[PDB]
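Q: Predict the assembly, please.
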Amino acid sequence: DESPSFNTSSLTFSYCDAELRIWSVQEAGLSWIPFFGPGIEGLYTAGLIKNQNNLVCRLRRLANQTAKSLELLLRVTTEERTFSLINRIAIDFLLTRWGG
Amino acid sequence: DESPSFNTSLTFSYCDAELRIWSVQEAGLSWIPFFGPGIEGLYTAGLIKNQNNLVCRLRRLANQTAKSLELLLRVTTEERTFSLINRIAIDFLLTRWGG
Amino acid sequence: DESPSFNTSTSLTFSYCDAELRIWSVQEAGLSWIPFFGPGIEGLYTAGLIKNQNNLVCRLRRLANQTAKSLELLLRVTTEERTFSLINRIAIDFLLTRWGG
Amino acid sequence: SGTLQKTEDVHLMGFTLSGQKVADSPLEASKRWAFRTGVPPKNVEYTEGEEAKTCYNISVTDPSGKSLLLDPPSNIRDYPKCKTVHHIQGQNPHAQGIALHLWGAFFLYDRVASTTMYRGKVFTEGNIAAMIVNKTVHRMIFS
Amino acid sequence: GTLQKTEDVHLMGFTLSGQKVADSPLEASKRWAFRTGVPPKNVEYTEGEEAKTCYNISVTDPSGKSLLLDPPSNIRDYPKCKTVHHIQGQNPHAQGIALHLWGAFFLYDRVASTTMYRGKVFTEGNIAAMIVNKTVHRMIFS
Amino acid sequence: SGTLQKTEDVHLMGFTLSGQKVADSPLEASKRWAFRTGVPPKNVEYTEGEEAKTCYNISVTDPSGKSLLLDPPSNIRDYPKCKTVHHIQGQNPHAQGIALHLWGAFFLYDRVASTTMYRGKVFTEGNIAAMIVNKTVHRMIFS
Amino acid sequence: LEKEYFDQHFGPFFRTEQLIIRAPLTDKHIYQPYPSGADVPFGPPLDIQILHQVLDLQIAIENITASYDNETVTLQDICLNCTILSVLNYFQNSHSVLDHKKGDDFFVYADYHTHFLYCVDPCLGTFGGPVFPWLVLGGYDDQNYNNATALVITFPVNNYYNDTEKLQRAQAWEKEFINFVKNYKNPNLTISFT
Amino acid sequence: LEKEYFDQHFGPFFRTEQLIIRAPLTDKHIYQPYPSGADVPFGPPLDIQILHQVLDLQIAIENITASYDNETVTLQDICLTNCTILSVLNYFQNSHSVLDHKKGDDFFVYADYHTHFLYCVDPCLGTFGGPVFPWLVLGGYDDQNYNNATALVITFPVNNYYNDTEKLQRAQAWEKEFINFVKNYKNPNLTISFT
Amino acid sequence: LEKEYFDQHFGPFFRTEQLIIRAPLTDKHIYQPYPSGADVPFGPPLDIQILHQVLDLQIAIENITASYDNETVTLQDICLNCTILSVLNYFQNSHSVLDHKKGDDFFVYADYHTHFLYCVDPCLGTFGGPVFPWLVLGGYDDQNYNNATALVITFPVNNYYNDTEKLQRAQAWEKEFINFVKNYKNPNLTISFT
Ligand SMILES: *[C@@H]1O[C@H](CO)[C@@H](O[C@@H]2O[C@H](CO)[C@@H](O[C@@H]3O[C@H](CO[C@H]4O[C@H](CO)[C@@H](O)[C@H](O)[C@@H]4O)[C@@H](O)[C@H](O[C@H]4O[C@H](CO)[C@@H](O)[C@H](O)[C@@H]4O)[C@@H]3O)[C@H](O)[C@H]2NC(C)=O)[C@H](O)[C@H]1NC(C)=O
Ligand SMILES: *[C@@H]1O[C@H](CO)[C@@H](O[C@@H]2O[C@H](CO)[C@@H](O[C@@H]3O[C@H](CO[C@H]4O[C@H](CO)[C@@H](O)[C@H](O)[C@@H]4O)[C@@H](O)[C@H](O[C@H]4O[C@H](CO)[C@@H](O)[C@H](O)[C@@H]4O)[C@@H]3O)[C@H](O)[C@H]2NC(C)=O)[C@H](O)[C@H]1NC(C)=O
Ligand SMILES: *[C@@H]1O[C@H](CO)[C@@H](O[C@@H]2O[C@H](CO)[C@@H](O[C@@H]3O[C@H](CO[C@H]4O[C@H](CO)[C@@H](O)[C@H](O)[C@@H]4O)[C@@H](O)[C@H](O[C@H]4O[C@H](CO)[C@@H](O)[C@H](O)[C@@H]4O)[C@@H]3O)[C@H](O)[C@H]2NC(C)=O)[C@H](O)[C@H]1NC(C)=O
Ligand SMILES: *[C@@H]1O[C@H](CO)[C@@H](O[C@@H]2O[C@H](CO)[C@@H](O[C@@H]3O[C@H](CO[C@H]4O[C@H](CO)[C@@H](O)[C@H](O)[C@@H]4O)[C@@H](O)[C@H](O[C@H]4O[C@H](CO)[C@@H](O)[C@H](O)[C@@H]4O)[C@@H]3O)[C@H](O)[C@H]2NC(C)=O)[C@H](O)[C@H]1NC(C)=O
Ligand SMILES: *[C@@H]1O[C@H](CO)[C@@H](O[C@@H]2O[C@H](CO)[C@@H](O[C@@H]3O[C@H](CO[C@H]4O[C@H](CO)[C@@H](O)[C@H](O)[C@@H]4O)[C@@H](O)[C@H](O[C@H]4O[C@H](CO)[C@@H](O)[C@H](O)[C@@H]4O)[C@@H]3O)[C@H](O)[C@H]2NC(C)=O)[C@H](O)[C@H]1NC(C)=O
Ligand SMILES: *[C@@H]1O[C@H](CO)[C@@H](O[C@@H]2O[C@H](CO)[C@@H](O[C@@H]3O[C@H](CO[C@H]4O[C@H](CO)[C@@H](O)[C@H](O)[C@@H]4O)[C@@H](O)[C@H](O[C@H]4O[C@H](CO)[C@@H](O)[C@H](O)[C@@H]4O)[C@@H]3O)[C@H](O)[C@H]2NC(C)=O)[C@H](O)[C@H]1NC(C)=O
Ligand SMILES: *[C@@H]1O[C@H](CO)[C@@H](O[C@@H]2O[C@H](CO)[C@@H](O[C@@H]3O[C@H](CO)[C@@H](O)[C@H](O)[C@@H]3O)[C@H](O)[C@H]2NC(C)=O)[C@H](O)[C@H]1NC(C)=O
Ligand SMILES: *[C@@H]1O[C@H](CO)[C@@H](O[C@@H]2O[C@H](CO)[C@@H](O[C@@H]3O[C@H](CO)[C@@H](O)[C@H](O)[C@@H]3O)[C@H](O)[C@H]2NC(C)=O)[C@H](O)[C@H]1NC(C)=O
Ligand SMILES: *[C@@H]1O[C@H](CO)[C@@H](O[C@@H]2O[C@H](CO)[C@@H](O[C@@H]3O[C@H](CO)[C@@H](O)[C@H](O)[C@@H]3O)[C@H](O)[C@H]2NC(C)=O)[C@H](O)[C@H]1NC(C)=O
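A: Predicted assembly structure:
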């Protein structure tokens, strides 16, 4: 599963519709308490991603690129609960960054 | 999830004086599960001396952690036990590049 | 638990008994990735030929039962029961003990 | 490259199949699904994602009546936002095992994508994508 | 800021009892409430403080069912308590899952919980992430 | 030194006692196990490894009839390859808690090993060894 | 003591109507004290949203006035602030007192501990007449009247046998009441005669 | 509408044999259309298997012929070439492919056993060139619903041969073994009997 | 069967005392052979816990003696160790043999059936006389001789009709037994006479 890095400076990338309507987890002062939180229903916030410099178009093509390797990865694991690849990518990123 | 790093007159870097706790025990055949102490006998009692004002700043970190860890637990979807030991290890390596 | 680097010479250079070693392994055809056209759960095992040409199997069996000294202590401490994969931990401990300053 | 600062900088959206102009009609979407016995079900977690134009709430039953889709895990919920919800219903008389996709697309649910279909609740087709963005870049792209 | 091996970091649980926060059986049920719409979550920890006051509260609805979550086999009782308080109460109108107002966590056997588990001993406190090696540990532990 | 490129390069092979000239005969292969209360059961995942000469399908029951061994999780399956599947049916009246190994060896199952033994299905005794190989060195020796 | 207080309401001058109402569909109700103690269970009609409806209807008994003759006559001027002998008068027939959730968050310290078992905030009657709490509750084992399932409502009505001027106001007062109970729309409580 | 049609078109004209088919061990059958629709439950004797079981009864009739004289007489010779068959099977023209003429993709069967059955309660025309009705075959139905029964009625119209006794003996001795065959039929799922 | 086989023993040769020991609440017990085999079910009175209390019962039966006049009262001098017809006599009425688990940890290779029908590792009676497995198992099914449900205990005692020295001893042998059977406290065992 390839992972690009969209960073500004030049809106360049590293390693299709323009209407990208998404939902996201939201990111006075008492909200961090779970009793005074927003709930899981209201946690979702509306958003809109613009494709100003082929950002959506380079990401929709990436979708089926990652379907190849990710299916093989889930085949090997004997654990059928929810698998967090969040640490997997971070650990792999550190291992492949160190060169020479 | 800010974490101090104890070192050494103790040098610290991110009230009740008495601090008595319990801890996981730190012998030939004892490492075999059949020759183990068990659930009840694993805990060892001990005391922490508030030597270099070390207890007092440890307890004021308590409310600072609860601000951040509630938000972390809200995002995650798994209801099972969540082990933060790996995340603190990865975050320490990730943020080490600055210094 | 300890783990050696089972790497090449640059022979078979090592790092930190029966010669015959029958193993079963998971493989490391155009439509193989999709699980509908995959092997399954009983047919992804491949047989193996291992040569004990550099005193190879003998020490790993001796090393396997030095591992149970410390792996049993780790499993006793942890409170989770279903599955505890160390594949992440060995990777982090590799990085933790490498960037020593 | 080396733009990772802290763990939840990495994001995982599942872009739906409507982008490639793949027919999401209640007639052609069922053509990309099939059955197989002998494979394990697996789950994967994703952070955020696109809301689908059309979503499906399909409860396939055998001629006996049991839902061929698996019992959902407790961490599996309904899909957040859907413009259209299609309640396609029907039966399969010969197939067995667990429901699987053909093209390779994952079935998207509430922050957890799956390789199988779960019992009688809203999902959508898609594939999850990994990337690394910080708050400065994400602020100017979110809206 | 040094770290050598994964088992160096500890998650200590410091209790509200030593913070001169009222742990009496009359002033301790004022910091808890209920809500419908939030999911229960758990967090493990390595070691914890001894508790002056512990509670074994089993709160039931007027029909009789306990509003507290069913404890997993993972979660066990708090190891050592100076005093165990067996308070019993009932919610007339409250519903959902039990939560905490100040932000503190219900502490159990090496796994802290955001929510409350039925008929079994807990103490209130937070989790402190902190790093100690072996040499500093014996210099501090007893 | 030691090199490591990607995470899956580590594999944990469980080397069995059968090839170590440890007596696997059913007369004296049941004296390395015992019972104890108060010890939590734990599991550990491994990638590949040797399969032994002999394998065991033992159904230990109390005098009432209940199996003294733990119910297997869905994660646990039968051990794939076994040259001989030895079937011993043992019964004891003075058990306590869960079954444990005297030598500290682990009960090996399908890619997940355990410190305890599970209900009425094939296992083998062995110990897990972890090590690191890349693509070219493993392919040279695995062949 | 038993028959000592009952002699003042069996007199010929008082024609008292007795009705017994219960909640059959309600389930068991248990209560346990704040510190600790025995889980003393309540009756099926002793719960929330089952005594409110009784309290709602008893207020509407005098709230709704029937157009009789050419003048408006209230029950207060013909009854002999009419005296109410029930369990509802222990809460002064008020919504706030009957749901006086004194306490805090998580669980409430007291809801009926200071209202019902306190005589076992004011607990005595506010109309100046003390009443024994075992009269309102019937169908209970031994002496323990706090473990029953029946509610009794007592409305003292003067006979007015020697006073025909005020007789007509009270004679037809209960004629609509007996018509009301058979025509009362309710899903939970049933009115019974004796 | 119960005996009116049977007494005017297939009355005392052809000497036919009527037998009933029962399926006790088979469970209940339901159907829901591929487009979002109503659950229409069917009876025991139909599902996805016993459909083939009743499909094999007629094909095992012409192959085995009674030893009469030196000629071979099958069901084709005794009828009035395609013959008149009245059952559920004539809706599929008494052929295997039409009964399993599945239409759909790998995940849904859009139309498996209602292209010919429920469509006319691919044409569903009978193999003998006559009109078909969903009520002549399904017995045990309730009220006006014809497709909510529990039994299948199969009848074989055979010419009376009153004016020609040469073909009457061909139509007389074929079922003498068949009436012995139905009581001795090896059938672990389907049960057949007279009335 | 026992009536026909013991019919010839009813003559003037020996006098036997028959008692029946039955296990009311003990669950069904099965034994499976160590290598492999069929699970042979035993009778209720054949579980580690029970039968030992019978061994204790037998010990208490034999050790208690009733003193008569100034003479010495012993069981050994009057019994023909002694003539015992039971299952425990295969174990020589000893606690060590009854719990002589000839096995390693985890499971025992053999603990109980290795002295009952193993080599019939002692396999002979403690007295040396003839003994059969169907003489103690009462309720067996045909050719099993071990598939019964109740235990029978038999004490063959000499008639002592011509021996005046032991006549009083034989008279007083069962005088303490006839009231020891109904005063011994046991909630999982029943003793019946004939
Ligand atoms: C870490 O930091 C936290 C704060 O982030 C400290 O913990 C406590 O935090 C709570 C929550 O903010 C504080 O308690 C609150 O204080 C207020 C008191 O208001 C009262 O004012 C007067 C009396 O002074 C009266 O009118 C009346 O009593 C008022 O209540 C209020 O905001 C809150 O009162 C609550 O009362 C009930 C609760 O049942 C509710 O109905 C009300 O709506 C309201 O929420 C509340 O009591 C508290 O002050 C903080 N403690 C301290 C010492 O500052 C931690 O102490 C700090 N340190 C550590 C080591 O954890
Ligand atoms: C990796 O692997 C090697 C090879 O397996 C290990 O070496 C073995 O270590 C085990 C550790 O338990 C040894 O097992 C023990 O050895 C002793 C044998 O002494 C007995 O010798 C004879 C035997 O007939 C008798 O005089 C008498 O029984 C002696 O006791 C004993 O300590 C143990 O006996 C136990 O046997 C069983 C349990 O095994 C119990 O029922 C008994 O009660 C008794 O406690 C036991 O057998 C084994 O002998 C070692 N083998 C060899 C070849 O050396 C290494 O330890 C390990 N390598 C590492 C960690 O580096
Ligand atoms: C990455 O993004 C690309 C581009 O959008 C997608 O590529 C598609 O890949 C699928 C793979 O399944 C292709 O679909 C297959 O195409 C083959 C041809 O089938 C017919 O296709 C053409 C046009 O539709 C017809 O004219 C002609 O009759 C062909 O027969 C076949 O291999 C497949 O059909 C098979 O299954 C059906 C049963 O349903 C039966 O016909 C047969 O069994 C047959 O073998 C299938 O249709 C698809 O064409 C590709 N699209 C494009 C635009 O190239 C990827 O899917 C995407 N990756 C993801 C989402 O994971
Ligand atoms: C009419 O009245 C009868 C008789 O009173 C009611 O039936 C019983 O009512 C009594 C109270 O009068 C109840 O008895 C109390 O029950 C509690 C025990 O229940 C606990 O059980 C286990 C504990 O192991 C746990 O599930 C849980 O903790 C339960 O709470 C205790 O509160 C009481 O015993 C304890 O308190 C006393 C207080 O003085 C002390 O001595 C000790 O601490 C003691 O341990 C007490 O026993 C009883 O539960 C009622 N029984 C039933 C079956 O409900 C009738 O219910 C009532 N009739 C109707 C129709 O409602
Ligand atoms: C003999 O008699 C009749 C037919 O002649 C049969 O009765 C039919 O049986 C079904 C099932 O009981 C009747 O009920 C229908 O079931 C469906 C329920 O909708 C939900 O179904 C499941 C519930 O878990 C959900 O998964 C699903 O998403 C749906 O939400 C619906 O199809 C029907 O509801 C609609 O029916 C009609 C639609 O035309 C409307 O008029 C209604 O208002 C409603 O919207 C319905 O409830 C069904 O009605 C019956 N069919 C008829 C009358 O034609 C008997 O069972 C049969 N007897 C035997 C022994 O086979
Ligand atoms: C009075 O009469 C007889 C004795 O004379 C007793 O009958 C015995 O009862 C058992 C059942 O309780 C008979 O059946 C045996 O049960 C076992 C079943 O096999 C599996 O059982 C469970 C399944 O979950 C597994 O745990 C277990 O490992 C086995 O896989 C087996 O022990 C036997 O199977 C064998 O049967 C014959 C035996 O020769 C072989 O041909 C087979 O291949 C197989 O190995 C068996 O089925 C048992 O046979 C009976 N014993 C006999 C006849 O001697 C009555 O119960 C008893 N009555 C009372 C009240 O006690
Ligand atoms: C997707 O389709 C499924 C199947 O029809 C829908 O599930 C249905 O959800 C409703 C509530 O929305 C359930 O009703 C409730 O069920 C239980 C008792 O069964 C109880 O909580 C309530 O009294 C209420 O009746 C209904 O049972 C359930 N149906 C099935 C078959 O499980 C689902 O809602 C659909 N999703 C959407 C977004 O519409
Ligand atoms: C805190 O209070 C709770 C609730 O009363 C206690 O938990 C309960 O403890 C009792 C007594 O041990 C358990 O009863 C059990 O019942 C059967 C026999 O009836 C048997 O399993 C045991 O012998 C035991 O008696 C009960 O199950 C248990 N309930 C739960 C939900 O765990 C708890 O013990 C109290 N804590 C302390 C520290 O006292
Ligand atoms: C190891 O021994 C165990 C028994 O100790 C064997 O498990 C047995 O597996 C068979 C199938 O191979 C099970 O039969 C099935 O049972 C149910 C109920 O009938 C049903 O799913 C099937 O119709 C079938 O009959 C059997 O119940 C099961 N035994 C137990 C006690 O669970 C296992 O197969 C052995 N491993 C081998 C031979 O490799």
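Residues 7 and 89 of chain C are 20 Å apart (CA to CA). The longest strand of chain C covers residues 23-26.
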